[PDB]
Coordinates of C-alpha atoms (C1' of nucleotides) and ligand atoms in Angstrom, one line a residue:
Chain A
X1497 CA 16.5 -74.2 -43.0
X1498 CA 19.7 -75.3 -41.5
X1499 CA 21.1 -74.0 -38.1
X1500 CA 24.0 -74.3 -36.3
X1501 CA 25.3 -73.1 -33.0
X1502 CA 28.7 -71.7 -31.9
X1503 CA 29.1 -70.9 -28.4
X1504 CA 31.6 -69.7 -26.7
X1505 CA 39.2 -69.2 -28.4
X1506 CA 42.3 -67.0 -30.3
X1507 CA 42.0 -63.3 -30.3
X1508 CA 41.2 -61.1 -32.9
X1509 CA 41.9 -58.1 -33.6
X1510 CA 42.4 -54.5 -36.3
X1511 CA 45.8 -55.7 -37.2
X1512 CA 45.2 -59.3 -37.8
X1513 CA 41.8 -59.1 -39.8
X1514 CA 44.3 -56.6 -41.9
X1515 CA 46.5 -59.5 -42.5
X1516 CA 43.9 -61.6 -43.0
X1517 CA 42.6 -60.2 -46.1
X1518 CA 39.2 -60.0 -44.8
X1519 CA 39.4 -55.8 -44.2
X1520 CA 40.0 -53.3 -46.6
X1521 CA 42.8 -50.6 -45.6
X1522 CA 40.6 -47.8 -45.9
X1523 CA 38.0 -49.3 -42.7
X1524 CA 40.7 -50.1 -40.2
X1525 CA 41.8 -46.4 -40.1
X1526 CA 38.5 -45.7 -38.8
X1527 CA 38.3 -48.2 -36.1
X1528 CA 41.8 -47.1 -35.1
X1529 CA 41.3 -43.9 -35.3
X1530 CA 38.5 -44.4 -32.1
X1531 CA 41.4 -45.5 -30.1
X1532 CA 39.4 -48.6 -28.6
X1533 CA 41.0 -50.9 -26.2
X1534 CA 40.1 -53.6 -28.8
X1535 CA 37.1 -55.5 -30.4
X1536 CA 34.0 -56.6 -28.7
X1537 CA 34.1 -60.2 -28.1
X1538 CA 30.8 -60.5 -29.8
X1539 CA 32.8 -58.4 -32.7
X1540 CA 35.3 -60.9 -33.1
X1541 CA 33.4 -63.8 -33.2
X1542 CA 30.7 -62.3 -35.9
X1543 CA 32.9 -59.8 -38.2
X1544 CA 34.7 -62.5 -40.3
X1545 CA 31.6 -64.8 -40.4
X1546 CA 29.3 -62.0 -42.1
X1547 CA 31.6 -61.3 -45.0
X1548 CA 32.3 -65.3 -45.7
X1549 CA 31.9 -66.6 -49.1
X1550 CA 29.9 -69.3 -48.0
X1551 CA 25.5 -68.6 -48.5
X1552 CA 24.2 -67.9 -45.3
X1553 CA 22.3 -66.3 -42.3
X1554 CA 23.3 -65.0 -38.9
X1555 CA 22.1 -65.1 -35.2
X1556 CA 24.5 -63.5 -33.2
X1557 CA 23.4 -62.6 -29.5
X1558 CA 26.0 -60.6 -27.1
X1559 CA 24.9 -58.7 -23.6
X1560 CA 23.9 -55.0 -23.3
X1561 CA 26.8 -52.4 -24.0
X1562 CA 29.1 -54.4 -26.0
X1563 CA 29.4 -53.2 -29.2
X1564 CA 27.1 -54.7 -31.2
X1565 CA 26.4 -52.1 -33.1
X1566 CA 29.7 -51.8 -35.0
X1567 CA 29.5 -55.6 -34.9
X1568 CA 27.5 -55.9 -37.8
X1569 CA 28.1 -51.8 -39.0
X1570 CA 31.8 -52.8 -39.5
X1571 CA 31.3 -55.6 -42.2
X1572 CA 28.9 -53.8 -44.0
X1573 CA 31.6 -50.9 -44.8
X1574 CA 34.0 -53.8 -45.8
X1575 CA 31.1 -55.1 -48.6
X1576 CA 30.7 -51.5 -50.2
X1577 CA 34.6 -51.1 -50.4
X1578 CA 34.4 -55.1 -52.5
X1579 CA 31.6 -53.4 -54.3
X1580 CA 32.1 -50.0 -55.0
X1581 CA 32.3 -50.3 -58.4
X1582 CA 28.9 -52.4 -59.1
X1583 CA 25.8 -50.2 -58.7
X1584 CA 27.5 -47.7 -56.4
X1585 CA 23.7 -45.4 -56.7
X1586 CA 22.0 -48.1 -54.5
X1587 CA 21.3 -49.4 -51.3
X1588 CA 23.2 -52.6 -50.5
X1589 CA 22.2 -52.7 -46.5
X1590 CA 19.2 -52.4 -45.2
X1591 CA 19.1 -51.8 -41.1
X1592 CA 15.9 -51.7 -38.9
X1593 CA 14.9 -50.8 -35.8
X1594 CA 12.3 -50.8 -32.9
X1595 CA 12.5 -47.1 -32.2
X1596 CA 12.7 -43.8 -34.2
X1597 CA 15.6 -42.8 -31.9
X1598 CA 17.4 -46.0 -32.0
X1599 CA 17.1 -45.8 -35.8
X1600 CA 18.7 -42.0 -35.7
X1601 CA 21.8 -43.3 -33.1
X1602 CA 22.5 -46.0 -35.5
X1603 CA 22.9 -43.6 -38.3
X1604 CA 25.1 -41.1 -36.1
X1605 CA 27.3 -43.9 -35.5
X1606 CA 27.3 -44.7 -39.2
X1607 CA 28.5 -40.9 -39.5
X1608 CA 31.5 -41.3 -36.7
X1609 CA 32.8 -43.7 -38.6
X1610 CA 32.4 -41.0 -41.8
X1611 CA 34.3 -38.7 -39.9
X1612 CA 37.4 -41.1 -38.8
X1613 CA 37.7 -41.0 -42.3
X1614 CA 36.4 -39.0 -45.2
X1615 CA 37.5 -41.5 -47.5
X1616 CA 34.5 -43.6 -46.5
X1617 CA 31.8 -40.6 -46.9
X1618 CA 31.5 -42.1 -50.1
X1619 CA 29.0 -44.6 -49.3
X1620 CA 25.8 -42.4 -48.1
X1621 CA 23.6 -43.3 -45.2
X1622 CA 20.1 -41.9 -45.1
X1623 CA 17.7 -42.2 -42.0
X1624 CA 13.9 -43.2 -42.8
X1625 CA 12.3 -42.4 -40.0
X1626 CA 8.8 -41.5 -39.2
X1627 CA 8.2 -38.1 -37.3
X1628 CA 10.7 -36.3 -39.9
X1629 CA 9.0 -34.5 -43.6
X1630 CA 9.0 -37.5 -45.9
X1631 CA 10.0 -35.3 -49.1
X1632 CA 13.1 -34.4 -47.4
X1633 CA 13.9 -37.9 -46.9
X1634 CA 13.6 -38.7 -50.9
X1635 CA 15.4 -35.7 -51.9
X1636 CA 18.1 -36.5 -49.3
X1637 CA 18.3 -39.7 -51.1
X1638 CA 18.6 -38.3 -54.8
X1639 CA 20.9 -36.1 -53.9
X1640 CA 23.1 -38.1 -51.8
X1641 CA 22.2 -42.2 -53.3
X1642 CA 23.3 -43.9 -50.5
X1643 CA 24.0 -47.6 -49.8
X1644 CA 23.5 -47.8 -46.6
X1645 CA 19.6 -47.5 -45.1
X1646 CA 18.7 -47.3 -41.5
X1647 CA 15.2 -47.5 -40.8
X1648 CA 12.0 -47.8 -38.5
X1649 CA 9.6 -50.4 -39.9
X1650 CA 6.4 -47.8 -40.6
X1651 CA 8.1 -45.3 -42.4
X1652 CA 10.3 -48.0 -44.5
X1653 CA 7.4 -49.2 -46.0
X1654 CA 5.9 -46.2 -47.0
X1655 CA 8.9 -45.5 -48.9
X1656 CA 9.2 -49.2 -50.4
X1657 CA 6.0 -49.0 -51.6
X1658 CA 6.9 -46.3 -53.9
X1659 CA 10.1 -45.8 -54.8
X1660 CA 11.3 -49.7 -54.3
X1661 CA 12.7 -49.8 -57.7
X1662 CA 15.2 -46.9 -57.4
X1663 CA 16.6 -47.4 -54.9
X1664 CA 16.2 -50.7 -53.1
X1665 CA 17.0 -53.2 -56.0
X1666 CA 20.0 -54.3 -55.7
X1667 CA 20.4 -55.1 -51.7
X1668 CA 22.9 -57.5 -50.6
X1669 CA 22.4 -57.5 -46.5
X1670 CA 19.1 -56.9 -44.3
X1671 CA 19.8 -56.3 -40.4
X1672 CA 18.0 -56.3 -37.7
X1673 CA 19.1 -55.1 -34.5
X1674 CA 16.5 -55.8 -31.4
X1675 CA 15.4 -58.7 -33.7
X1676 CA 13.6 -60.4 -30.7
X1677 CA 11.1 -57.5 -30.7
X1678 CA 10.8 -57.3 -34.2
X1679 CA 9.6 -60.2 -34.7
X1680 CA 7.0 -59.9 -31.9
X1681 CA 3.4 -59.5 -33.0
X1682 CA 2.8 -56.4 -34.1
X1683 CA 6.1 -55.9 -35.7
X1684 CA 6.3 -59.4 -37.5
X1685 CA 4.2 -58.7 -40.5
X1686 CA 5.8 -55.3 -40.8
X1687 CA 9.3 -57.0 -41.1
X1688 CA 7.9 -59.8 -43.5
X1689 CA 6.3 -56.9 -45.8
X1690 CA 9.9 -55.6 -45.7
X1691 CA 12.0 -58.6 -46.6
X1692 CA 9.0 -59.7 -48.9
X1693 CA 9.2 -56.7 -50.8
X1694 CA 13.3 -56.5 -51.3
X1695 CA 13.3 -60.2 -51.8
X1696 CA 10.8 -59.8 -55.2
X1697 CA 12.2 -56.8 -56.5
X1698 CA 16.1 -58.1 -55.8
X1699 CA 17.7 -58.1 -59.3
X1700 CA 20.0 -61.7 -59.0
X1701 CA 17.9 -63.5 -57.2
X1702 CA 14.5 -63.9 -54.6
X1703 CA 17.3 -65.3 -52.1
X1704 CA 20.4 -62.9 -52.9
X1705 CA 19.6 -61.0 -49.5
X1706 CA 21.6 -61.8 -46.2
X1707 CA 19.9 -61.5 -43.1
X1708 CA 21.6 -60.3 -40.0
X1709 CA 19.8 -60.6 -36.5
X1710 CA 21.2 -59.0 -32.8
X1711 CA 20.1 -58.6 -29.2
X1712 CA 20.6 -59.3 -25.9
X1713 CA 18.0 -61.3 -25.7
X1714 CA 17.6 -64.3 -28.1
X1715 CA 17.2 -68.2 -28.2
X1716 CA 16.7 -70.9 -31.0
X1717 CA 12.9 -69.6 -31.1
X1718 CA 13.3 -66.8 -33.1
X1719 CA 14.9 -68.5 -35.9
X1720 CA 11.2 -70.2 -36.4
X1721 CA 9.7 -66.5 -36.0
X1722 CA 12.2 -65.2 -38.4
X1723 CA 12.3 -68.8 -41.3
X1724 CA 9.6 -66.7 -43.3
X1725 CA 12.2 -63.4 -43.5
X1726 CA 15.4 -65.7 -43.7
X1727 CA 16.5 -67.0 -47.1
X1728 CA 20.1 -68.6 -46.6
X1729 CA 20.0 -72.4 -46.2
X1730 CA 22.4 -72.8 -43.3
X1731 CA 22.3 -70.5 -40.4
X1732 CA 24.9 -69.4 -37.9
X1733 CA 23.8 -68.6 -34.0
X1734 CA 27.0 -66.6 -32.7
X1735 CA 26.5 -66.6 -29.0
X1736 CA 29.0 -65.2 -26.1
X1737 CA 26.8 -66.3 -23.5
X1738 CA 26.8 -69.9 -21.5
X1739 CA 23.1 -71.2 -22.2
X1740 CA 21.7 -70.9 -18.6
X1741 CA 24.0 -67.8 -18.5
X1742 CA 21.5 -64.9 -17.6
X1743 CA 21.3 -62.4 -20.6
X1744 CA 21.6 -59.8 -17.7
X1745 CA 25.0 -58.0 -17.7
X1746 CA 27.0 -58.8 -14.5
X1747 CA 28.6 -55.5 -13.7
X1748 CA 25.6 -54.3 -13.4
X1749 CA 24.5 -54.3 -9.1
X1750 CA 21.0 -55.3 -9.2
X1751 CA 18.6 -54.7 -6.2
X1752 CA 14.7 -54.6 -5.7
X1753 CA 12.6 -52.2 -3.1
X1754 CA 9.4 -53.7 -2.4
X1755 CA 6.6 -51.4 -0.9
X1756 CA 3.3 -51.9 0.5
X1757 CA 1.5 -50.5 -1.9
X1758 CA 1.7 -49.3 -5.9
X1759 CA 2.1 -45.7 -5.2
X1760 CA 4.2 -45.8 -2.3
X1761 CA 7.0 -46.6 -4.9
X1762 CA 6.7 -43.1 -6.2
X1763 CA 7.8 -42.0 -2.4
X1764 CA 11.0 -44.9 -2.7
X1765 CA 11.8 -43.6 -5.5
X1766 CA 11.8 -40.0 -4.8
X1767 CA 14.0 -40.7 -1.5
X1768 CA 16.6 -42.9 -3.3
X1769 CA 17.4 -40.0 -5.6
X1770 CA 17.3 -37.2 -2.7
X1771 CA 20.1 -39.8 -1.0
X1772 CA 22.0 -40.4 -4.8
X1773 CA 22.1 -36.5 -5.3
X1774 CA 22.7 -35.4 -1.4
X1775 CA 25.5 -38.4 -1.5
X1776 CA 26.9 -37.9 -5.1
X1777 CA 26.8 -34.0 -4.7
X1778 CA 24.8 -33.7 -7.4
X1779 CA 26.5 -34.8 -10.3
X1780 CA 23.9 -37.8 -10.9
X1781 CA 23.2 -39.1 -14.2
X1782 CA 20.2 -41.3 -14.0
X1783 CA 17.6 -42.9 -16.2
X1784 CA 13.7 -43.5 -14.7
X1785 CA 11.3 -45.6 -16.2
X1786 CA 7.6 -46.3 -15.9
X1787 CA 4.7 -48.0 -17.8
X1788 CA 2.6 -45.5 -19.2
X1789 CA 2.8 -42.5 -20.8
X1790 CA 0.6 -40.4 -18.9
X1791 CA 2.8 -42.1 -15.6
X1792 CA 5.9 -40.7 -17.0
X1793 CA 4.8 -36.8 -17.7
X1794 CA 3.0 -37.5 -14.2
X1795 CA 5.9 -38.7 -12.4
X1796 CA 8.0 -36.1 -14.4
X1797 CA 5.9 -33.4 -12.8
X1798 CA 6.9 -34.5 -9.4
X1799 CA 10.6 -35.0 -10.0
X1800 CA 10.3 -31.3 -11.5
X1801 CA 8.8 -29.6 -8.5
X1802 CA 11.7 -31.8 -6.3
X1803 CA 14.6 -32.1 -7.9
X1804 CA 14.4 -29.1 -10.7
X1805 CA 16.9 -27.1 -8.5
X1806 CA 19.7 -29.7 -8.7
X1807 CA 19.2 -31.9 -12.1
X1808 CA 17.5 -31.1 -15.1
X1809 CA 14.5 -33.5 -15.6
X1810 CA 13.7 -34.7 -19.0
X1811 CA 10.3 -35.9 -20.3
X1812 CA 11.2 -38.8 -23.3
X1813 CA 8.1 -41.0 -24.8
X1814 CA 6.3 -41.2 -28.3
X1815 CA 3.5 -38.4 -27.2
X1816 CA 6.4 -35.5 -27.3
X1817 CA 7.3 -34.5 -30.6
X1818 CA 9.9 -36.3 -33.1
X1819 CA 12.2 -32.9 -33.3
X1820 CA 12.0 -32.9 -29.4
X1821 CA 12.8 -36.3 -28.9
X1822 CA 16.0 -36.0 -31.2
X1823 CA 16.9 -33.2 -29.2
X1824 CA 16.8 -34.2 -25.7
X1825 CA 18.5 -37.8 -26.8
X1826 CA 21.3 -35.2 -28.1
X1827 CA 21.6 -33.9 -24.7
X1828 CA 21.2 -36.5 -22.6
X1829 CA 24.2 -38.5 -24.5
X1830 CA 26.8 -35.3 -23.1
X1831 CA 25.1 -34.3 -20.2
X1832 CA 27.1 -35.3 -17.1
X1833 CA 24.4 -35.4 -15.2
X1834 CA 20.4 -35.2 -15.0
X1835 CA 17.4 -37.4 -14.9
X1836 CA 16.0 -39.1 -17.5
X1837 CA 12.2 -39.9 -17.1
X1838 CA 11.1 -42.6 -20.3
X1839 CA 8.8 -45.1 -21.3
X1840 CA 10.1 -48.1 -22.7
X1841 CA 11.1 -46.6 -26.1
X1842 CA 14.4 -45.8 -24.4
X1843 CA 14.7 -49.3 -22.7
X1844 CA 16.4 -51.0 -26.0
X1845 CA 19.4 -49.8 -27.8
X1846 CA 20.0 -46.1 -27.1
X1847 CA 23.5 -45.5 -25.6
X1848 CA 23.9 -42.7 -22.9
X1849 CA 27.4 -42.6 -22.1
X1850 CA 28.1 -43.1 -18.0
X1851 CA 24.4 -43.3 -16.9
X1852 CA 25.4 -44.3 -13.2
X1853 CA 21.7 -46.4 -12.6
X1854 CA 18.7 -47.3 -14.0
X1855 CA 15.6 -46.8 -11.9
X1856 CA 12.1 -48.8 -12.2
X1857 CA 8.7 -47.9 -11.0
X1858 CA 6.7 -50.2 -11.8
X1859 CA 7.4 -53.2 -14.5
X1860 CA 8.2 -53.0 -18.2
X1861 CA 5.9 -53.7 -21.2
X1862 CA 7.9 -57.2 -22.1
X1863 CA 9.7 -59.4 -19.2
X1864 CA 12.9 -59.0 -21.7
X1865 CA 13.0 -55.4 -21.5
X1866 CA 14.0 -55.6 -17.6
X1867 CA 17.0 -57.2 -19.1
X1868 CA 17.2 -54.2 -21.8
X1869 CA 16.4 -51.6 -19.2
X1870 CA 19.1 -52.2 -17.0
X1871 CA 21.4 -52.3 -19.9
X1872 CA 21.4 -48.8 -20.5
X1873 CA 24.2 -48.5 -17.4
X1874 CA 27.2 -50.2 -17.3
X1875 CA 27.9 -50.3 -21.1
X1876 CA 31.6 -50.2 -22.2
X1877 CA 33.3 -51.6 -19.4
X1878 CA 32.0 -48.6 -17.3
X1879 CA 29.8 -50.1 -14.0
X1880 CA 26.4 -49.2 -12.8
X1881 CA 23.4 -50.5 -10.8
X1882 CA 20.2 -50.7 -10.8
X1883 CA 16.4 -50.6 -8.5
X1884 CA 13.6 -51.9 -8.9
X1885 CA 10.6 -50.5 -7.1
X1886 CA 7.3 -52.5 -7.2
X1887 CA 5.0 -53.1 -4.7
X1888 CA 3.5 -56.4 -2.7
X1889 CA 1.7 -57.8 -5.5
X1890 CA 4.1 -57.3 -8.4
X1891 CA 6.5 -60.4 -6.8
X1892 CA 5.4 -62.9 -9.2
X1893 CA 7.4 -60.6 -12.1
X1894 CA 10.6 -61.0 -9.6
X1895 CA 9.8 -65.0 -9.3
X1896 CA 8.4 -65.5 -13.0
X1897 CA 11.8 -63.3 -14.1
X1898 CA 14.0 -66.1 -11.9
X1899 CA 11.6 -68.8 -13.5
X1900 CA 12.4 -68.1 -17.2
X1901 CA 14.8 -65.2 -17.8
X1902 CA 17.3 -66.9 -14.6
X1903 CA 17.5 -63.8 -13.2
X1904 CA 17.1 -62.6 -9.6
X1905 CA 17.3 -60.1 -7.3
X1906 CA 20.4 -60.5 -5.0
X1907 CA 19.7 -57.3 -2.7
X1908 CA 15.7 -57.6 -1.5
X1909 CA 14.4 -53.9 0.8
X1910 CA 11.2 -53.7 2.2
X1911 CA 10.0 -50.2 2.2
X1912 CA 7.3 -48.1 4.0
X1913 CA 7.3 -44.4 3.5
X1914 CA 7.3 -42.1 6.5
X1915 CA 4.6 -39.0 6.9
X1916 CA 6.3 -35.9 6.1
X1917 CA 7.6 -37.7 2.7
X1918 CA 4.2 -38.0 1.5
X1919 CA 2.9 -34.3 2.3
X1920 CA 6.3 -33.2 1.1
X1921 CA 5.1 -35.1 -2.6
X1922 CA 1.5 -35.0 -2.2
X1923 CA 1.5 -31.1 -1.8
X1924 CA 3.8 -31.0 -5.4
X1925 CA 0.6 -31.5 -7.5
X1926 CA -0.9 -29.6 -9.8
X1927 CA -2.5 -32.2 -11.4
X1928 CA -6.8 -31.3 -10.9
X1929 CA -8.8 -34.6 -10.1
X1930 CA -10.2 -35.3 -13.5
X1931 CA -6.7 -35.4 -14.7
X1932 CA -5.3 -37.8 -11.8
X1933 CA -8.0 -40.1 -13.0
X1934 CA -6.5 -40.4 -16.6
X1935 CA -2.8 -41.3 -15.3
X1936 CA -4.2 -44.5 -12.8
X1937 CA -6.6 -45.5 -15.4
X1938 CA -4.2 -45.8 -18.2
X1939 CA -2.1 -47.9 -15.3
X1940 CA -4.9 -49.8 -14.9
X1941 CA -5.3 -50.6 -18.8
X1942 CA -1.5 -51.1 -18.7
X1943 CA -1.3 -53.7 -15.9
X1944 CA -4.0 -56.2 -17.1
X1945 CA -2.4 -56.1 -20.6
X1946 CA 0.5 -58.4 -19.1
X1947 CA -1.2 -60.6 -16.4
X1948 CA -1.1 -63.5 -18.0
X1949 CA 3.0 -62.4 -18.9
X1950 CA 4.0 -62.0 -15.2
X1951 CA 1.5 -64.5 -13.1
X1952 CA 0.0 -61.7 -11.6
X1953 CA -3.1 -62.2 -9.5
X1954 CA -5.8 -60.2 -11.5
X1955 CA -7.4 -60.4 -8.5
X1956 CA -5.6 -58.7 -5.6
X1957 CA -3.2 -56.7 -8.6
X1958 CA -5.7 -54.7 -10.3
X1959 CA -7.2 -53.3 -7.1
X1960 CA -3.8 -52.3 -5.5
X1961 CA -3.3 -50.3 -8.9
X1962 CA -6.0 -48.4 -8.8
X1963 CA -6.2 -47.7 -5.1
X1964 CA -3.4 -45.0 -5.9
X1965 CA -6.3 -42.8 -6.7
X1966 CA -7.1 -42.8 -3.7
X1967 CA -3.5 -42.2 -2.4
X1968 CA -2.8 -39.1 -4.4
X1969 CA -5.8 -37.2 -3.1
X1970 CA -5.0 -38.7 0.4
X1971 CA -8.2 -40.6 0.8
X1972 CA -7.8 -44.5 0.4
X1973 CA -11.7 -45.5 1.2
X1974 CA -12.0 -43.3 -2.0
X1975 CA -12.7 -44.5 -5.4
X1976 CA -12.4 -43.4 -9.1
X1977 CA -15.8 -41.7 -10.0
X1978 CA -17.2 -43.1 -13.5
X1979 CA -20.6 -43.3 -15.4
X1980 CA -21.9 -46.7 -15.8
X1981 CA -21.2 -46.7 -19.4
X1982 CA -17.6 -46.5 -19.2
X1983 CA -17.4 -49.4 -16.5
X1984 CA -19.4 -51.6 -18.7
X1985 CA -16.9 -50.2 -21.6
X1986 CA -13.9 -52.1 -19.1
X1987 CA -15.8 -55.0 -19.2
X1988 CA -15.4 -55.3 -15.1
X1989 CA -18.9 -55.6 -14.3
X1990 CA -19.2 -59.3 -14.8
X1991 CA -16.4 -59.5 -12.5
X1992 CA -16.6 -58.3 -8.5
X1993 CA -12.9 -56.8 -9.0
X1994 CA -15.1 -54.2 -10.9
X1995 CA -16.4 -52.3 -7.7
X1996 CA -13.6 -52.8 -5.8
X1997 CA -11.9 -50.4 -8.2
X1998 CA -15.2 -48.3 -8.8
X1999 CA -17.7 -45.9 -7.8
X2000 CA -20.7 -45.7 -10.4
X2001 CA -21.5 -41.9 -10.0
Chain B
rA908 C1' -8.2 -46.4 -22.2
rA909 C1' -3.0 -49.4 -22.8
rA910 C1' 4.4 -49.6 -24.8
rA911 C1' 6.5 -49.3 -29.8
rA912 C1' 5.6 -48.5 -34.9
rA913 C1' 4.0 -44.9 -42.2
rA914 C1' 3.5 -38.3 -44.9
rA915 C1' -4.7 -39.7 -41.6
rA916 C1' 0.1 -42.7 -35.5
Ligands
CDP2277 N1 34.9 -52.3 -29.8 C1 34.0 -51.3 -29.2 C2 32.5 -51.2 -29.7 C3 31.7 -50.2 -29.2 N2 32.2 -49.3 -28.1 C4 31.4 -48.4 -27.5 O1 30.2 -49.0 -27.0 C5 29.1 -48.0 -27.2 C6 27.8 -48.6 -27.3 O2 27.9 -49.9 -27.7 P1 26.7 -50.6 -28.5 O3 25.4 -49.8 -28.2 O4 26.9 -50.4 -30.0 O5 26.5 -52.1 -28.1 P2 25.1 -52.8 -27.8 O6 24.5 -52.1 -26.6 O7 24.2 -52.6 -29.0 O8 25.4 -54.2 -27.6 C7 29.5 -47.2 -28.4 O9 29.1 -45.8 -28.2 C8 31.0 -47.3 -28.5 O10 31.6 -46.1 -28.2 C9 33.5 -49.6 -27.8 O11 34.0 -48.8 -26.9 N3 34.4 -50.5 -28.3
BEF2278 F1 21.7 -52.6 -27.9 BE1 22.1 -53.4 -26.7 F2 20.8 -54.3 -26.3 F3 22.4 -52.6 -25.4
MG2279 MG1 22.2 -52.1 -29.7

RNA sequence: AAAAAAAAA
């Protein structure tokens, strides 16, 4: 399929799209009525391009924090006021997302734009997301027949493949925000069972459908990831970013703490925040994230048992319930301050307004979610920084992230923790031995999953991650205790790494 | 065992 590029020019703006033709009276109140300084310039360069007469797809790619969101939202209002009198009952936009949560913002911002007008309730959004009671969902969508659809992948298709025909049949647009990662394996033949689906049952044509893709973090390669879900001819890649440009936002003040070893991050971490609080008299908003689930309710523990008495600590991952995650994501967006301790499903997408840094222990699932991570500060023209704390073995993630993604650290710390730090931590544990195992294992299981990813040195890595076992007990000639079945479950005993990590008891 | 992702996740 055709593509062409359009980098990086005249204004635009409410008024002049107004004049213009290409916006209907009835959106610009809403817009204005938000009292923005002005459009996004990802917004301007991608609003009047969606809604063109001319057959074709989109590629747009604009940094972290920058109204993307609205970017594609905005025209999609505009196509249901140029259509409101042809099958007003149906969906006409399709939107999908990594993340439950993101799926949920998407829809509340859907519903701000519902409440800068009431003119524009009109056109329904329903939310099909998993976690929620699926006849809820339907009989929100009888009652209320909405054209606009914002889903996660899972629980879209569970829906498609049974009530495709009443709904979905008559779909004009298809976005996909994060595209990148939704067209990574494991969520690729999710999204082509989605267009698939929407394309066959489409009532003009296989090829009626518009597809719309966004992120911060997006090349020419996805377009040959996403030919099988794209059914334009000619494609348009909307870019406000310089080619060798990093896709890193520069407000943002990146630095990197690098310890001896693994755990002594935990000890970093802890001190940065005691300083940030001390220093910022309370009054800290903060987000903390880790690689593992079991990590983040461990490292949550400690931050309780620390800093309980000044912030409010809050647990966020897929292993707490759907109603609880909706809740704290609530919270979090109008708290003023308080720590947020995640996995990576709140690396992409969700908005916390003023989040004054982003902290790291460890490294993220996907080299392109360092990029998303630190996106969560610094978003609307507010600033923000951002640590990283890894350890002596993790550098080739800091090199390899200069080697492709061209970004690196300008601020480097070496870090060794004092004595009284680690009795002071150490002594905050209720964790029992048997369940400290299951938090360095999973760590374990999490950091040979992206060797080959980061250059690590499987070698000298995988060791220094499991000698935190022996760290949290204060004992580092320890080792993890297993049976021999387990270790020849890991597959380690053909290599020598395997009792280096080990003890078969 | 390992981050996301459907009413068995
Ligand atoms: N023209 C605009 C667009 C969005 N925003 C704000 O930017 C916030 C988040 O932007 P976003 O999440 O949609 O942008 P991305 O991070 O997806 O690129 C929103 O809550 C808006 O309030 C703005 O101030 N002005
Ligand atoms: F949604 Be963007 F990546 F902050
Ligand atoms: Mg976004």
């Amino acid at each position: 399929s055709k593509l062409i590029h359009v980098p990086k020019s005249k204004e635009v703006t409410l008024d002049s799209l107004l004049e213009e033709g290409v916006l209907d009276k009835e959106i610009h109140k809403a817009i204005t009525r938000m009292e923005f300084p002005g459009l996004t310039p990802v917004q301007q360069k991608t609003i009047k391009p969606i809604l063109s007469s001319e057959d074709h797809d989109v590629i747009a790619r604009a940094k972290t924090g920058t109204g993307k969101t609205f970017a594609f939202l905005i025209p999609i209002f505009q196509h249901l006021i140029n259509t409101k009198f042809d099958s007003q009952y149906m969906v006409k936009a399709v939107i999908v997302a990594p993340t439950r949560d993101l799926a949920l913002q998407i829809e509340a911002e859907v519903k701000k734009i519902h409440d800068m007008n009431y003119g524009l309730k009109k056109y329904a959004c329903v939310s099909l997301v998993g976690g929620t009671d699926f006849r809820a969902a339907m009989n929100k969508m009888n009652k209320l027949r909405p054209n606009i659809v914002i889903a996660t992948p899972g629980r879209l298709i569970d829906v498609l493949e049974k009530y495709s025909n009443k709904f979905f049949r008559f779909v004009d647009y298809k976005v996909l925000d994060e595209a990148d990662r939704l067209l990574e394996i494991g969520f690729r033949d999710d999204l082509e069972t989605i267009s698939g689906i929407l394309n066959e049952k489409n009532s003009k044509s296989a090829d009626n459908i518009k597809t719309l893709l966004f992120s911060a973090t997006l090349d020419d390669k996805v377009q040959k990831l996403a030919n099988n879900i794209m059914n334009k001819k000619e494609c348009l890649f909307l870019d406000t970013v310089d080619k060798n440009e990093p896709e890193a936002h520069e407000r943002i003040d990146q630095s990197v703490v690098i310890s001896e070893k693994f755990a002594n991050s935990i000890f970093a971490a802890v001190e940065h925040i005691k300083k940030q609080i001390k220093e910022r008299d309370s009054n800290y908003k903060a987000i903390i994230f880790a690689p593992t689930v079991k990590f983040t309710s461990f490292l949550c523990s400690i931050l309780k048992n620390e800093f309980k008495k000044d912030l409010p600590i809050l647990e966020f991952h897929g292993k707490i319930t759907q109603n609880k995650r909706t809740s704290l994501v609530k919270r979090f967006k109008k708290d003023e301050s308080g720590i947020l301790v995640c996995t990576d499903v709140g690396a992409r997408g969700m908005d916390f307004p003023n989040v004054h840094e982003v902290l790291q222990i460890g490294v993220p699932s996907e080299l392109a979610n360092y990029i998303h991570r630190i996106g969560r500060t610094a978003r609307s023209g507010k600033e923000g920084s951002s640590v990283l704390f890894i350890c002596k073995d993790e550098l080739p993630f800091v090199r390899e992230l200069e080697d492709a993604k061209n970004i690196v650290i300008a601020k480097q710390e070496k870090y060794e923790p004092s004595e009284e730090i680690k009795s002071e931590v150490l002594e905050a544990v209720t964790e029992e031995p048997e369940d400290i195992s299951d938090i360095v294992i999973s760590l374990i299981s999490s950091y040979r999953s992206c060797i080959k990813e980061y250059r690590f040195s499987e070698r000298r890595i995988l060791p220094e991650i499991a000698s935190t076992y022996g760290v949290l007990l204060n004992d580092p000639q320890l080792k993890i205790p297993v049976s021999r079945r387990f270790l020849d479950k890991l597959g380690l005993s053909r290599s020598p790494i395997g009792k280096a990590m080990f003890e078969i008891r």
